[PDB]
From a paper:
Alzheimer’s disease is the most common form of dementia and is neuropathologically defined by the presence of extracellular plaques containing Aβ in the brain parenchyma and intraneuronal neurofibrillary tangles containing phosphorylated tau. Peptides between 37 and 43 residues in length are generated, with those of 40 (Aβ40) and 42 (Aβ42) residues in length being the most abundant. Two human fibril polymorphs have been determined: ‘type I filaments’, which are mostly associated with sporadic Alzheimer’s disease (SAD), and ‘type II filaments’, which are observed in familial Alzheimer’s disease (FAD) and other neurodegenerative disorders with amyloid brain pathology. Here, we determined the structures of nine ex vivo Aβ fibrils from six different mouse models by cryogenic-electron microscopy.
For tg-SwDI mice, which harbor the Dutch (E22Q) and Iowa (D23N) mutations within the Aβ sequence, we observed three different polymorphs. For DI2 fibrils, an atomic model of residues D1–V39 could be built into the 4.2 Å map. Except for the N-terminus, the fold is similar to the fold of DI1 fibrils. However, although the medium-resolution map allows for straightforward modeling of the main chain, the assignment of the side chains is ambiguous.
Author numbering:
A (entry chain D), B (entry chain E), C (entry chain C), D (entry chain B), E (entry chain A): 1 to 39
């Protein structure tokens, strides 16, 4: 399996008035935001 | 399997007034936002 | 498996008025935001 | 498995008015933000 | 497994008005922010 074999693009411009934010370049796994119950 | 074998494009412009945000370039797995019940 | 075999791009521009933020380049695992219940 | 085999890019520009922030280059494991319940 | 085999990039520019911050280059393990309950 091959992915992004050459140049790519991604960006977010002029963000404001945020409460919860999560920025990740690469994530080889799991991402969790707001959790209440126990694991 | 081959994907994005050459140049690509992606972006978000002029974001404002957000509560919950999650930005990821590449995610080889799972993504979770708002969760209440336990895993 | 091969990924991002060449140049790439990612960025966030002009962020303001944030409460909770999490920025990661590479994450080979799990990411947690707001958690209340015990693990 | 091969990832980011060549140049890459990532950045955050002009951040202000933050309460909780977490910046990581590489994270081969887990990341926790706000936790209340015991582990 | 191979990652970041060549040049890379990451930075945060002009940060201000922060309460809790955590900056890490590489983290081969776990990261904790605000914790209340005992481990």
């Amino acid at each position: 399996d091959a992915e992004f074999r050459h140049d790519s693009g991604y960006e977010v411009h002029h963000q404001k008035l945020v409460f919860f934010a999560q920025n990740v370049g690469s994530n080889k796994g799991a991402i969790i935001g707001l959790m209440v119950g126990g694991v």
